[PDB]
């Protein structure tokens, strides 16, 4: 029997191939409650659903002095900015009605640590997506290669254009 444990990690962790270390409870011999240490070396670009089984290290008993195997399944914690899709990251930029039409100068924190400025002088199509090649997650195969970054905009609209407001528009 295998035991599947969900392993919550951050996009930051598997972007750099971070190392996870924690303890898990397991039923030991002679009615005991033990806690085994586990260290998982995440590889840059690792995805959700990827497994890492640790043979015999769980509960105790195939009617013979042994333990169930543990199988960790990488799950990625929600990121306040980035949503992951394969090799790349999708980010939603909150624009204001004004800058959605006039243009904007924004600077956001990428996934590696550097900062990427998002600039635009032309009106932005609310349902439009802009793509920044190479700013996504590293590709598991060749971590040297990164997916892209997709930016979406959440153009905030005026709830009640007052009087004066309710005019110019036309």
């Amino acid at each position: 029997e295998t035991v599947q444990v969900n392993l919550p990690v951050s996009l930051e962790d598997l972007f750099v191939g971070k190392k996870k270390s924690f303890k898990i409870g397991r039923k030991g011999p002679h009615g005991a409650s033990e806690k085994t240490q586990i260290d998982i070396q995440l590889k840059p670009g690792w995805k959700a659903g990827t497994k890492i089984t640790y043979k015999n290290q769980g509960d105790y008993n195939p009617q013979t002095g042994r333990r169930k195997t543990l199988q960790f399944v990488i799950q990625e914690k929600s990121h306040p900015n980035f949503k992951r899709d394969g090799d790349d990251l999708i980010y939603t930029l909150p624009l204001s009605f004004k800058e959605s039409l006039l243009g904007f100068s924004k600077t956001i924190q990428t996934i590696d640590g550097r900062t990427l400025p998002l600039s635009r002088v032309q009106p932005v199509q609310p349902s439009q997506t802009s793509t920044y090649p190479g700013q996504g997650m590293p590709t598991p195969k060749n971590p040297s290669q990164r997916g892209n970054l997709i930016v979406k905009y959440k153009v905030d609209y005026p709830i009640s254009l007052n009087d004066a407001q309710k005019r110019a528009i036309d």
Copy 2:
């Protein structure tokens, strides 16, 4: 129709004329989602806004088996130290109240890889700029030639000169 994609690169990349390689998504034939590989050979000294169109390689359809052309526009990622202005690099040196007046011995990492020591024995005018010819970006025309380097200083001031402090000054 042309598709303009912002290509984020580093000052380090276009200083050496680095090679960029990545994949971009494109709608293929028969309702398909493809990803085309692109390799761009940046020339030393390349600037922001410079384009590199790849004829027919994007989405699919001038109502006839063809693809939209892709146009990459070089954008330069923000550098933690250098700000670029034409052919040269502007760098801000954090000085301390003491060294802003007394003098300093600093060593910073240039854009090529070598190290340039910044030294001074005299008080530094807070709004002053020092110029180091040839330490900027290579000139696209003759990469052998480099722009200059401008150093600015961010002289940190004492927030509350305590008692004793609040005296000597005068």
